[PDB]
């Protein structure tokens, strides 16, 4: 459970979808960044004395977004995981560069979490959505929708979670 | 291989142009290396790989993906050092108004500095004059074949360095 359960209490405490996705990101890159390290000598401090600088914020291989090129690049992500994170990376950067606020039940959020690969692995689980003459009555409408979304979120958070275990292997 | 680049340390007429051909052929030699040891395959991953190998990219620079060999456990510190030493100086070189000589100790000491003309053998020094005038003539020739002989000597070392780098 430990790992696991740790990152995803970490994630349900994201307030937001923004929240949210900050979140990920920074799981992430914690994750591959236990990866970059056990690739690069994590030893020799001579080594260390070209790997830290190239691998610092600054550097060349500081960002993560290129950390995944090169990891791809090199063999060692599969096809499948590097798409993914490069997909959320770019998720994350949209809302952030957004005014607007969306939430999980939004088309352009549910549907690029579709789109993921793992999410197709995995396959998912929607609450029905509220339609009108429907047996949904209109006081837990709201609550209802609050559901839907701590139902994709959750989802997304298992896929997330799968995600670092394969980096961890 | 192992000729047609003796042939180019050859044709350089002087230090600057010698230090010059002898990165381009560190840069090539490099490449090809750098080149197998990324996936080279699928539209997809040539996507990726395509610009991150390109100049503009992360791994455009030579002496960046130096860094990254090495790191990676494909280089050893002999050979890194060298070649990133040999930068250093092809760029001093690439910055200064004065033209140098083979025989000249700004040029020469870091020169007899690398792992491998300590280590294949290209091992001297020479006592700087001529003693006085009415004596140029001969010390000129002896100068000039000294130089021709440290010039020879780099130019083992780095067929070398580059016969290591594709193995």
């Not at 005014?99 to 039940?105: G, K, L, P, Q, R």
């Not at 559901?147 to 799968?162: D, F, N, T």
């Amino acid at each position: 459970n430990i790992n696991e359960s740790e990152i995803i209490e970490r994630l349900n405490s994201a307030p937001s979808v923004r929240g949210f996705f900050i979140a990920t990101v920074d799981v992430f890159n914690e994750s591959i960044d236990g990866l970059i390290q056990r690739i690069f000598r994590k030893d020799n401090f001579a080594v260390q004395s070209v790997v830290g600088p190239l691998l610092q914020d600054s550097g060349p291989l500081g960002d993560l977004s290129v950390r995944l090129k090169l990891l791809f690049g090199l063999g060692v992500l599969p096809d499948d995981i590097y798409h993914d994170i490069e997909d959320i990376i770019k998720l994350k950067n949209h809302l952030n560069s957004d005014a607007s606020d969306y939430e999980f039940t939004d088309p352009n959020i549910l549907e690029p979490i579709k789109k993921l690969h793992l999410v197709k692995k995995m396959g998912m689980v929607q609450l029905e959505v509220n339609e009108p003459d429907d047996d949904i009555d209109l006081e837990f409408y709201q609550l209802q929708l609050q559901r839907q979304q701590q139902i994709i979120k959750s989802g997304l958070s298992l896929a997330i979670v799968e995600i670092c275990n394969e980096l961890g292997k």
